[PDB]
Every structure is written in C-alpha cells, then in structure tokens.
C-alpha cells in the first residue's frame, strides 16, 4: 500500500543497492533465489513495499538497475543475491560515462534515460499506491552522478507528489579516488537541491573513519562501508514494513526535518556500531544507544556537528523498549547540548519507535540529522571547483559534449547560495 521504487545508478550506487537488497532480504527472510524462507508472519506481511509477487511464494524487488557500463550488470548478476533482480529491469549502455558529467547527462544518459523511465513507469504503475522513490548513486563519478541527476529531474517532473530520497555518496579530498570529481559534484548539487524531497549525504572518509575507530576492522573494503550505508537505508524505512509503538514513514520524517525547502541535506548514522572486542564489555540499552547516535564520531557525512547546530534531529529506534526512557534520553541530549541546537525551534528531535529490530540485535536506532555542518562538506567541493575552474583545467572534456562555462558558473553560484543558506541560520 506504500510501495517504494529503488533505483541504482553507477558503480557505487549499484554496489550499495546490492548490499541494501541483501540486507532487506535478510530482514524479510527472502531467499537469494527469490523464495520466502522467513519464520515470522510480520516479515511476509507488508512485503509489497520492497517486493513484487511472482507466484509460488517467489518475490522479486522493485529495483531498477541502471549503469552505462555492462560490466556493472555482469558483476551484479555474478555477485551474491544477483539472481534476485528482474532481468528486464537491467538497463545499460555501451560504455561508461568516463567520469564525464556531460557524457552521462546529455548524450549517453539522454539515450538511456528513455528506457530507464519506461522501466520505472512500468514498475510504478503496477504498485497499488507508491509512497515515492529512493535512489542510490555517487556524486563523484560521471555515470552515477550525471544520469542519476537526470533521472531525478525526469521523475520529479513525472511524479511531483511522491517522496524522492537520494543516498548520494559525496566526494571528499582525503579519500579522493578521481580527478574530475569536483566538477560532477558541483553540477549535481544544483539538481539535488532542486528535485529531491530529502537527500542523505554519505562520505567515504566518514565511513572509513567509522570502520577504523568505532569498529576495529582490519583492512576494511568497500563492502563494509556499503553495509553500513545499507543498514542506515533499511533503518530509515523500518516503520513502513513493521509495526511499532510510534510509527513514522518517509513523509513524516520529511515534515519533521525540513524547516525550509532547500534545507533537506541530512546526516545519517547507525547506533549499535561497536567493535567485536567490546561486544561483551558494553550494554546496548537506550542511554548509550542515543549517546552513540549523537556522538560526532558516528556520522557518515564526514562533518563535525560541533561546528554547527542541528536544525532538526531524528532517531528511529527499533526493538522492544519503553517510550519514557526514549523521551527522557532525547530531552537530556537536547538540553545538555543546548549550544549544538537552534534556539528558534522549541523541539529539535523527532522520535520513532518500531517493534522489530534488525536480526541479531536486541535494539537498534538510526540517526539522521539536518545539521549545518554540511557547510564544510560543500565548502570543500566549492574550493576544489574554484581552484580547477580558475585555470579551466579538464574543461574541454565537458565542453566537447555540449556543456558551457556558463553552466559551471550557474552550478557554482547555486551551491554557494545553498551553503550561505545553511550558514545564515548558524548564527
């Protein structure tokens, strides 16, 4: 009754989406072949949110797997849980955008977006009542960033009323892996501001820092970071699929956390993250859970919230718990840190509780925050873009597909306006 359409774009988007679907199938007890092997009636109930029916208790996701490189489709199919997806939902081009925003946004992305929209519309029309769309991509690349932004614009044009959540992986200079990432990020920020209901900024630096200092993982790979992002993504929409004492869908979170239309860039997080060595030395009750939630070192946006007060906060709890403890913990964390919250808003934290925790955990909480620390996240990109555009480096690659310097200036101005909007409420 509240179906969600999932779109994966680019290599990072496809890998995070594969991890996300693996985690959801774990939660719903769905076999990797599409069969249902769950043991609880709750998992099968309201399974239509993320899955369709294929007869003989076989369920397939509503995912649309999108990339300009067929190698990503081959890897997804060969990887675990790759048999779960519908083959007709695999849409691909001849070759990747090559880290070029224009290549993936004006010619190859334009040619493939028709097929992608056809698949998305076919999936959406089958739903009884879709709540909205969620999309996973990376801002640093060409294919993901550019053509995912094109998809965002097209879908927002087609479905103006539905909730649009993008879990974009923003680039950071510490863990830079490409050269022309600032150009694509700056060109995508404008589209993300314009045509998204709520976007969850994710950074690789923050995920590596979490895996290194919160966990004690030796040689973390992309799989662990994708699993953390997957856990956050699953915990965001846990109320839609399971009963709870105080439910909250995506629209409720958007209402709570968006004081103003452009101020919807969130900061995700996960509560029960702790090392394997410290499993037995630390309890997992509500107080320490919220303490982690609001800890500055447990954020996936690679920004210190201590440099900017939160506009709003939201901790979506899971598992059996008492609302009194949750409410008093939220009040304590909002009063003891009054310098880290805005005064002009009386209550900053929205609390949601679900009765089903993730498998293997007694209770879990997902923290998302509309802090003003995103100022630094976009300031890094603005600085890099300004430095590169001062001497017009690598610009001929973008101008060779139809772009112009005027569009680059427009994107830079829009992102500067957004960061100024965050700044002027910091005070």
């Amino acid at each position: 009754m509240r179906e969600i359409v999932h779109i994966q774009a680019g290599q990072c988007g496809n890998q995070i989406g594969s991890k996300f679907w693996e985690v959801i199938s774990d939660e719903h007890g769905i076999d990797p072949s599409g069969q249902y092997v769950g043991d609880s009636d709750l998992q099968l109930e309201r399974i239509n949110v993320y899955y369709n029916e294929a007869g003989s208790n076989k369920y397939v996701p509503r995912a649309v797997l999108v990339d300009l490189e067929p190698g990503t489709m081959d890897s997804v199919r060969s990887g675990p849980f790759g048999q779960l997806f519908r083959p007709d939902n695999y849409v691909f081009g001849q070759s990747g955008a090559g880290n070029n925003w224009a290549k993936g946004h004006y010619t190859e992305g334009a040619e493939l977006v028709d097929n992608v929209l056809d698949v998305v519309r076919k999936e959406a029309e089958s739903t009884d009542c879709l709540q909205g769309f969620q999309l996973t991509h990376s801002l640093g690349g060409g294919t993901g960033s550019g053509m995912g932004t094109l998809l965002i614009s097209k879908i927002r044009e087609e479905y103006p009323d539905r909730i649009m959540n993008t879990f974009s992986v923003v680039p950071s200079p510490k863990v830079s892996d490409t050269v022309v990432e600032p150009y694509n990020a700056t060109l995508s920020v404008h589209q993300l501001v314009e045509n998204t209901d709520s976007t969850f900024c994710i950074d690789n630096e923050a995920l590596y820092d979490i895996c290194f200092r919160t966990l004690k993982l030796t040689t973390p790979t992309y799989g662990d970071l994708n699993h953390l992002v997957s856990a956050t993504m699953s915990g965001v929409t846990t109320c839609l699929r399971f009963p709870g004492q105080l439910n909250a869908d995506l629209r409720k979170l958007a209402v709570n956390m968006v004081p103003f239309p452009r101020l919807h860039f969130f900061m995700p997080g996960f509560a029960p993250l702790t090392s394997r060595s410290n499993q037995q030395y630390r309890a997992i009750t509500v107080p320490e859970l919220t303490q982690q939630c609001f800890d500055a070192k447990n954020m996936m946006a690679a920004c210190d919230p201590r440099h900017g007060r939160y506009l709003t906060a939201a901790a979506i709890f899971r598992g059996r718990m008492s609302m009194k403890e949750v409410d008093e913990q939220m009040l304590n964390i909002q009063n003891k840190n009054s310098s880290y919250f805005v005064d002009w808003i009386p209550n900053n934290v929205k609390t949601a509780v679900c009765d089903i925790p993730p498998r293997g955990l007694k209770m879990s909480a997902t923290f998302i925050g509309n802090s003003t620390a995103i100022q630094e996240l976009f300031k890094r990109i603005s600085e890099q873009f300004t430095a590169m555009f001062r001497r017009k480096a690598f610009l001929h690659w973008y101008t060779g597909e139809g772009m112009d310097e005027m569009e680059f200036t427009e994107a830079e101005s829009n992102m500067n306006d957004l960061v100024s909007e965050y700044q002027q409420y910091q005070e």
Binding site: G96, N99, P173, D177, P182, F394
Partner: protein
Amino acid sequence: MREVISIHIGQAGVQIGNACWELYCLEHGIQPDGQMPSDKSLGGSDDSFSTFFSETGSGRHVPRAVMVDLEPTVIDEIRTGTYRSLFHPEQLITGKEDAANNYARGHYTIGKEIIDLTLDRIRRLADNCTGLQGFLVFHSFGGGTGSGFTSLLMERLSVDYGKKAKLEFSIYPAPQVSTAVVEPYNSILTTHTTLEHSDCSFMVDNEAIYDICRRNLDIERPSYTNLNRLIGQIVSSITASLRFDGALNVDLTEFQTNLVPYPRIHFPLATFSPVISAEKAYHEQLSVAEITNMCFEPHNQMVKCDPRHGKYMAVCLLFRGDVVPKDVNAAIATIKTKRSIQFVDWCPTGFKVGINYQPPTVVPGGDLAKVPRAVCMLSNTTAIAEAWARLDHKFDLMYAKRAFVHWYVGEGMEEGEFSEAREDLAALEKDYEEVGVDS
C-alpha cells in the same frame, strides 16, 4: 564486449609487439600456436580473452593485431618464429624496402605503396569487433618507418574513425644513447603528427630503461628484449581494467578524462615501479606504500628526465592484485604531504586510482620477479619539456648547417616541413611553460 586494436609499426613497434602478445598469450592462457587448451574458460567471467584475441569457430584465437613494416626482415622472422601460427597471415603486412631511417620515404614514397592495404586490414578487423574501444599504436619515435608510416596511418585513422581513442607507445630518443645520426629529424617531423592526431602518447627512452634494468634488476648489459618485456608489462597493466574485475575500474575514456587536462597537453610518462629481481624481492616487503613511493622517485621513471623540475599535473595509478583502497588512500596522503613532490595549484586532486584484482603475470625466464602487487604511475608531468628542449637543441644544431636535408627533399617532402615541425615543437614547449606556472 570490449575490444581494442593493436597496431605495431616499424621494427621497434613489431619487436615490442612480440613481447606484448607473448604477455597477453600467457595472461589469457592462450598457447603460442593459437589453441586455447582450457575449454571451461570459454564461458562465465573467463570471456576476457575477447578483448585482445578474436575467437574463431575452429577453436583458434586470432589476435587483433596489424604488424606492418616496410621491410620484410622482422615480419619474416615472426613468420619463421614460434608465433607463426598465432597472427593472421593477412595481418602481417610486409613491404620490400625499409624507409632507410628517412621520414619522407616512410611517409610518401614507400608509404603510399601499402597504406591502402594497411587501412583495409584495419577496417576488416574493426568490422569484426562490435565493442571497439580504441587503438594501441607502437612505433619507434625517431625511426624511418615508425615515424613516416606511423604519421600517415595515424592521420588516415583519425580521418576514417575519429571519436575512437588512439593511444601511442613511442620510443622517444634518449638524450645520449642514440643509435642513428638522423634521429632528431624524424623525431621532430613526427612530433607534429603525433600531437595532432593521437590522444595519449606515452614516450619511452631506451637509456632510462637501461638504467632501471641496471639498478633494480642488476642486469649489467641488457638488450632490447628486456625493454620490450617492460613495455609489454606497462601496456598489459594499462589494459587490465578492460578485461578483469576489480574496484575502481578505469576505462580508456576514464583515463583520458582524468589525465589529459587540455587538448594539446596529452604527453604523459609511464613507470612500472615494482620491478625487482628474484633475490631482492624476498627482502622487500612489497606493500602498497613502498610500491607507491617508488613510483615518484626520479630513478624509476622510464623517460630520462628529472621530475623534480616539473610539477605533476595528473597522475593515474593503476594498481593490480591484492590492493585495498585504504592503503591507496594512505599512500596518496603520504605522497601529497611530501614537499619534494610538487603538484600544480590548479589541481587540488590529481590522483586517479584504478585497482584490479588480477595480479601481474610473469613470463618464465623473465627478469621481473613474481609480485602480489603492481602499479603503473602515468603522470602528465611537465618535466619532460626538458627532453623536448634537448630534442629541439639537437635539431637546431643539425639544421643550422643543413646536414641531411637533401635526403629528405629527394623523396617528395618539402624543406619547409622542418621549420613547421620546429615551430610546432616550440609552441608545444611554450604551452607546457604556460600551463606549468602556478596561478
């Protein structure tokens, strides 16, 4: 699904292609006679052989190569060698007389004889592959055939295809170890064409690889076989991302976008840092940090130039084997924090990282030891403008007296081409000077 075309021109190009195709045959498990003994490899993810070797219904695999030369000696040596049955007989194009180390002979007089046949064979190969990704061109930068015929074929290919990528692996003349007295003439005449029509030209010096073999391999008196093997290793590591699975795959278009900032500033360097003997490898730890550090030292560059005088502009590190991105990030941080390694101010991030999960293969009898990790550091550094300056100085010294101009003008090539090429190279050096200086 993704295929590239390898074109080898001149004696140096054909000889380097020998090592390149030996490396490919060992890497993809293809016997030199053409047969592929592994039937199970004809399926699943093991379909990587289609990138280089075209499949036939008889079970044989035909390399997508065009070994063209104006003289028949080297191609006949191939035809009598071990790889006689590997290449298609029609692809092995031969002339009757070499270019005699003359640019004009290879460009017009002898070029026009077989340029049509070469283009026909290239078109026939291209029409067979449905996922043509680009062209790999191997040629001596200062030879006769490898200059003139390479110029002609490159301009004809640019006319015919256009948007398809074209990557050149040239043998740049060494500052001191030059085997012919007329090397700079051919070098600067072909500089005009290789700049206009190519996309990424990775020049190589024989003396630099000689020094690398002497130091890192303790090979006192090396030969051309070692140089060809090293160049083949570099090309295999470059093309590894097109046929193997790994995090951060780098396509040819990704490489060009990341590394080439301007249409004319497209002449990078190349180095295969983890070169080491079988003995020193036991003592070395051979981790990501040290192999990344060894890339940037001046003694590991395969062009005889000192990078310290030239600020780096864009670096593409193509890792292989057991590599985790955290190690690459730590190595990048340590490289950026170094004061000696000077980058430009207009490139805040200049590292493009490509990781592959296929460890490098080692040819039996080769000097390179078996390693778990490998990396190619292709840097668009400005310091090679010193090498171009040396070449221009040599050209000026010979052209002040008209040393051998009559040889060139006797084959239908005008004398004004020398001045045109000299001013083009001067403009290229001026562009490098303009780009290198900080804002």
